[PDB]
Amino acid sequence: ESADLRALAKHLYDSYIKSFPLTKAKARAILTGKTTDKSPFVIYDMNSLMMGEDKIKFKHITVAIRIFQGCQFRSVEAVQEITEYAKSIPGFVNLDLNDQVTLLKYGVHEIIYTMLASLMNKDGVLISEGQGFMTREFLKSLRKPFGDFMEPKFEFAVKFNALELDDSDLAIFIAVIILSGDRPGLLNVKPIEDIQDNLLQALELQLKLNHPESSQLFAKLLQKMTDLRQIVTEHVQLLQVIKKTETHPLLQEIYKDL
Amino acid sequence: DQLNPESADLRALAKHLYDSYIKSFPLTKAKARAILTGKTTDKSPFVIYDMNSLMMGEDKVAIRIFQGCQFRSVEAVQEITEYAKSIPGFVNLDLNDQVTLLKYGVHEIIYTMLASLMNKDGVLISEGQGFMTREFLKSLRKPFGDFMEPKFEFAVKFNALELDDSDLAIFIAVIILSGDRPGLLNVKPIEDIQDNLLQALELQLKLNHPESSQLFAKLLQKMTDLRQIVTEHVQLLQVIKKTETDMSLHPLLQEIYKDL
Numbered sequence A: 001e002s003a004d005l006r007a008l009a010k011h012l013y014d015s016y017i018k019s020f021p022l023t024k025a026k027a028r029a030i031l032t033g034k035t036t037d038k039s040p041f042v043i044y045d046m047n048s049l050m051m052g053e054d055k056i057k058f059k060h061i062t063v064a065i066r067i068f069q070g071c072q073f074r075s076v077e078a079v080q081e082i083t084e085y086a087k088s089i090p091g092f093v094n095l096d097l098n099d100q101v102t103l104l105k106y107g108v109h110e111i112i113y114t115m116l117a118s119l120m121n122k123d124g125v126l127i128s129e130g131q132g133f134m135t136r137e138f139l140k141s142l143r144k145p146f147g148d149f150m151e152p153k154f155e156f157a158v159k160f161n162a163l164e165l166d167d168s169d170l171a172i173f174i175a176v177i178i179l180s181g182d183r184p185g186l187l188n189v190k191p192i193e194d195i196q197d198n199l200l201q202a203l204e205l206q207l208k209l210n211h212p213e214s215s216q217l218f219a220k221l222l223q224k225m226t227d228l229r230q231i232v233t234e235h236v237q238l239l240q241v242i243k244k245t246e247t248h249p250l251l252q253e254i255y256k257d258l
Numbered sequence B: 001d002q003l004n005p006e007s008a009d010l011r012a013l014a015k016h017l018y019d020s021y022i023k024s025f026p027l028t029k030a031k032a033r034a035i036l037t038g039k040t041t042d043k044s045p046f047v048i049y050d051m052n053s054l055m056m057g058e059d060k061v062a063i064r065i066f067q068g069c070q071f072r073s074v075e076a077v078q079e080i081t082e083y084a085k086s087i088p089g090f091v092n093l094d095l096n097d098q099v100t101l102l103k104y105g106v107h108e109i110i111y112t113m114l115a116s117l118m119n120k121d122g123v124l125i126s127e128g129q130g131f132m133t134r135e136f137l138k139s140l141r142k143p144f145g146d147f148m149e150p151k152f153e154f155a156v157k158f159n160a161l162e163l164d165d166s167d168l169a170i171f172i173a174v175i176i177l178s179g180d181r182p183g184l185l186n187v188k189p190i191e192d193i194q195d196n197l198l199q200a201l202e203l204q205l206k207l208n209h210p211e212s213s214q215l216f217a218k219l220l221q222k223m224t225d226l227r228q229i230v231t232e233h234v235q236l237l238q239v240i241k242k243t244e245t246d247m248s249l250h251p252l253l254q255e256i257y258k259d260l
């Protein structure tokens, strides 16, 4: 039923808004777009960093490393947002808690690199709630171990953004990724898929009404997950090698592995 | 529900791909399910489940079994190749782009075709005449016993979709005409052809499996499993390259494997 799918969308979008501070609109204004009225601190040098870090304020402060530990803080911060969001997806709370937890522990990575793309352009990604901007070439130029961490995220986002999806389209697409269903260790895989399908239908009507002129956008968007999985896979890989570099107590704890 | 000149051309594409499909690959899935379900015994499969069996299966090791899979795939590449030529637009693209799509597409497809030759217990071999068991394979010399396992895992969740050849023919095409492949020169032309193949598929499903809701989405996601599989395969494949040096990989499979 058209209306049903339409309201499921308004609801989810409404949730996307209260769960996520930096919406993609609010982030395009600030980014490559003019708007904003007053741009963010740009970090392109080892010196702009010290200045931005010392002036742009910061939470994760106690080079190539301090940056990594930077993502981590924001990620661990993201995950909390995504999770409070998942809890609004109709019927998510009603699933087996063991399942719910497995859906997050597994889909939280893709919902990040998905939303990261909203804060990206070919030359860099917004930082600190958009109050900053770290150039892309600065990042790829970091110490040997850390110069490939964010590069493949750029390569993806450049493609993902190709679809020019807005918030309301991403709110649904995101739901669809959480109510995955093929995550290892799931107990009652049925109600999950039962909801995803109810999410997938809403994505369709949504992507059809919001991008009528975009041919087979639904198909194209679904195949981007084949790209997210590869990022998250290739990512967790590097994330292993970093342990053959870093090798704390109460911190190493707060950052299990996100 | 209804019709329209729009859908019409697609259907004709659905039928064109299906025809060239049946024409390109000898062993379809239909003939595959026939053999596998011992319900139809107009001609049944010999079974290999241990060395003893394997030994007698020549009446009509872990290495030679390997040079078997290897050989089959060279022929499967050929079949997929010829099938590609028949894909509307493909032979019109830059000769290079063609070589690229065939490059990063042959396996993601060979593992699709492979699922229609499988079932939890085993897989068909030698045109469907034989049937090797998961167990036996999963018990070959230390390294060679991990090759096929991940295939079965996939074939299992894949076949779950319940797709028949007229569906695979379109999806098998949607795979070649990718566009997000490494080393492509002109892309939008490649993208355009596919956005069409996709249109065909989305219809061929909503029509051939009416009751199967969101089969279009469920199936596109399965493409992830294929990359992973190709990944894992190449690395295990990398190992046999250094441990077994007296052994030889096939030039074709060799030239097709040179990137991520």
Ligand SMILES: CCO[C@@H](Cc1ccc(OCCN2c3ccccc3Oc3ccccc32)cc1)C(=O)O
Pocket (backbone or CB within 6 Å): B065, B066, B068, B069, B070, B071, B072, B073, B076, B110, B114, B123, B124, B125, B126, B127, B128, B132, B233, B237, B253
């Ligand atoms: C080692 C070769 O790896 C190939 C890929 C590949 C792997 C498995 C395949 O399934 C083949 C199934 N099969 C088979 C399985 C086990 C032993 C022998 C044997 O021979 C035949 C003969 C006819 C049909 C099917 C088979 C295909 C390609 C490659 O990397 O390119």
